[PDB]
Ligand binder design. Structure first.
Ligand SMILES: [Mg+2]
Ligand SMILES: [Zn+2]
Lengths: 47, 52, 45, 516
RNA sequence: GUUUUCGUUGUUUUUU
């Protein structure tokens, strides 16, 4: 469902203030485990 | 993922209504509760129940 | 006394209760308590 | 221990003052030995002892006090810091005691840091006034103290923690003139403040504090309640009248303008108002990459939403996001376990502010500028103390340098130390820098030695920073004073700083121009 | 100091 629409039908004279958000492409990242002290490292299954 | 994402697309609506009336300079990085698709999978794979 | 050894970098060392789990040179948080040099006796049967 | 708990102490001072003045009734009622008394009207003639010793502001303020006394009730006497408030009040009290118009004991409430001070001006300006502090001296013992504390006793002193130690036999009997030297420990209603304070039985009610309004007009209403019985209205009335309109605000201004000037005219004759250079440089540093990582990690977590929905308070989620801005190493679970026994807990350049700390402080270290380092937490003091000890080590190992010589003061130390350290900074060419943690420090400590000031973390109260700057910007400071604000851009520091600016506007359009 | 202090829900797999 790639369509997300909002509106403010009233005034702004009369108007459809149309907040409209369109979806797009996804992103895939390589495993990285991001330690809790900012010492981010790429994660290995053994670890 | 269908289930969890169908409860993902909607929390954008249920936050861009409380701010649309203020029409603030919404960050848009705070209405996206990203742990939406973490916990359903965690519970399904950990407890064993495929749902919520 | 209580000696410690790193993951695979072979760093040998010793933490105390003042520092977090972190191999001091390699920066490896998978550390291992170094084995005791103490003798263990067996029955060979 | 100057006091009049035992009548012997009273008698000695009384005799000494009688002999001093000498060269039917209570002798002091006679005029000055060499001049006359100042008769303002029939019921008020100030003794010649103190009347010419006052000056313009002081004289007209005692005049204001007498005007309120005649008009009955009282007012919140608050002006610029220490503008002869004590002198004015005691001179006025001596004025009423002089004309025999004091027919009932006077009560004065003061902090525990000025208890002996408040008894001192009584002793020195007006020895005829007897005085009794609310302590072991001035459970039966306090009852024999009560014996003849109303007839013999003239003025009773109380610490504003000590009333609820002996309130059983204080709030019962009637009272005359009432003084409270505390305008920031009353604030808004609904507290132990109202429980032990506003139950006093006397129209005469005066508060001595130049900073009554720092948070909101609810504090204004609660402070007006103590002096006057409600010339404005009830708390619901006070709110529904002008609370929202002032905040939101044309459509607000003009109606709001009149509704506010009405309040200004209603409360203006119930509280007096009187008021080198300074440089305010604010640096906007950025969050470091390890800081941004820990910022996003905490940013997207269950605990924040859990706080938002209501099971917890936002006060514990903005204290931890300020915990990371000071430096990354403060959001650790082992904080106490490595604070002072792990020399890597502090570190440098990870906070995003060490560099603008190292550079800025070393630009004065060789320049010899006594500067003020300011925090709010004693936990960050550990980090800035490890950092400065490492700086000391580096400087001492090499040459052509000088020890940094810091010190830390807080609630952990004792009330006895105070002035000593407060002094060792002014009167020593060494001891260049010292952290202060501007909550404990700012009660009036004299640190005119400082010329530079560093603000590290923004606070919540917009007022706590003015005393901080006043720790080096005292009245008539010897040399120019500068302020360097630390501010992490794109963080909660932005929101707080804008909030503090809005708060400054609040007290800068209510009292300056309601059209803003 | 004789004496002396652990538990459950749910889930899976099991055992002639
Ligand atoms: Mg069987
Ligand atoms: Zn290692």
């Amino acid at each position: 469902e790639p369509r997300l629409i909002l509106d403010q039908p009233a005034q702004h004279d009369n108007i459809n203030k149309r907040y409209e958000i369109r979806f797009g492409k996804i992103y895939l990242s390589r495993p990285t485990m991001t330690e809790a002290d900012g010492t981010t490292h790429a994660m290995f299954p053994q670890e | 993922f269908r289930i969890l994402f169908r409860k993902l697309t909607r929390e954008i609506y249920r936050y861009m209504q409380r701010c649309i009336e203020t029409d603030r300079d919404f960050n848009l990085n705070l209405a996206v509760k990203s742990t939406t698709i973490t916990s359903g999978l965690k519970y399904s794979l950990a407890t064993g129940n495929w749902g919520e | 006394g209580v000696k410690y050894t790193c993951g695979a970098c072979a760093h040998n060392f010793s933490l105390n209760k003042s520092d977090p789990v972190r191999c001091k040179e390699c920066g490896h948080r998978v550390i291992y308590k170094a084995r005791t040099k103490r003798m263990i006796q067996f029955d060979a049967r | 221990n100057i006091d009049d708990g035992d009548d012997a102490f009273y008698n000695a001072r009384l005799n000494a003052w009688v002999t001093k003045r000498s060269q039917d009734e209570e002798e002091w009622f006679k005029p000055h030995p060499t001049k006359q008394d100042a008769i303002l009207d029939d019921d008020y003639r100030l003794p010649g002892d103190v009347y010419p010793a006052l000056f313009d502001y002081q004289k007209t303020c005692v005049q204001w006090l007498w005007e309120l006394y005649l008009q009955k009730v009282g007012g919140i006497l608050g002006d610029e810091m220490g503008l002869g408030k004590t002198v004015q009040i005691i001179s006025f009290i001596a004025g009423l005691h002089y004309t025999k118009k004091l027919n009932k004991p006077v009560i004065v409430v003061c902090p525990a840091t000025v208890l002996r001070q408040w008894c001192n001006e009584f002793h020195r300006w007006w020895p005829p006034l007897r005085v009794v502090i609310l302590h072991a001296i001035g459970e039966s013992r306090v009852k024999e103290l009560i014996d003849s504390v109303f007839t013999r006793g003239h003025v009773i002193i109380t610490t504003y923690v000590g009333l609820r130690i002996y309130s059983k036999h204080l709030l019962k009997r009637d009272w005359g003139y009432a003084i409270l030297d505390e305008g920031h420990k009353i604030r808004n209603p609904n507290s132990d403040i109202s429980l032990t304070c506003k139950q006093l039985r006397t129209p005469n009610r005066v508060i001595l504090s130049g900073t009554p309004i720092q948070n909101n007009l609810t504090e204004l209403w609660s402070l007006f309640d103590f002096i006057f019985p409600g010339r404005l209205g009830t708390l619901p009335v006070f709110q529904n009248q002008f609370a929202i309109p002032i905040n939101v605000g044309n459509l607000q201004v003009q109606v709001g303008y009149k509704c506010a000037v009405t309040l200004k005219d209603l409360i203006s004759p119930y509280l007096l108002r009187r008021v080198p250079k300074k440089s305010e440089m604010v640096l906007f540093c950025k969050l470091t990459a390890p800081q941004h990582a820990l910022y996003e990690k905490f940013l997207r977590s269950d605990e924040l939403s859990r706080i938002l929905q209501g099971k917890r308070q936002v006060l514990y989620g903005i204290d931890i996001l300020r915990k990371i801005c000071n430096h990354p190493d403060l959001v650790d679970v082992h904080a106490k376990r490595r604070s002072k026994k792990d020399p890597t807990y502090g570190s440098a350049s990870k906070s995003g502010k060490m560099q603008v700390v190292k550079k800025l402080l070393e630009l004065w270290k060789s320049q010899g500028h006594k500067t003020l380092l300011f925090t709010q937490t004693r936990q960050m003091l550990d980090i800035l103390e490890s950092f400065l000890e490492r700086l000391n080590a580096k400087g001492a190992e090499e040459e052509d340098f000088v020890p940094f010589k810091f010190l830390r003061m807080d609630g952990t130390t004792s009330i006895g130390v105070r002035q000593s350290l407060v002094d060792v900074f002014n009167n020593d060419p060494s001891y260049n820098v010292f952290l202060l943690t501007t909550r404990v420090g700012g009660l009036g400590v004299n640190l005119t030695g400082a010329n530079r000031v560093i603000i590290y973390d923004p606070d919540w109260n917009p007022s706590t920073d003015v005393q901080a700057r006043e720790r080096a910007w005292r009245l008539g400071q010897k040399k120019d004073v500068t302020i360097y604000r630390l501010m992490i851009a794109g963080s909660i520091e932005e929101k707080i700083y804008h909030r503090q600016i809005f708060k400054q506007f609040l007290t800068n359009k209510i009292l300056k121009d309601p059209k803003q």
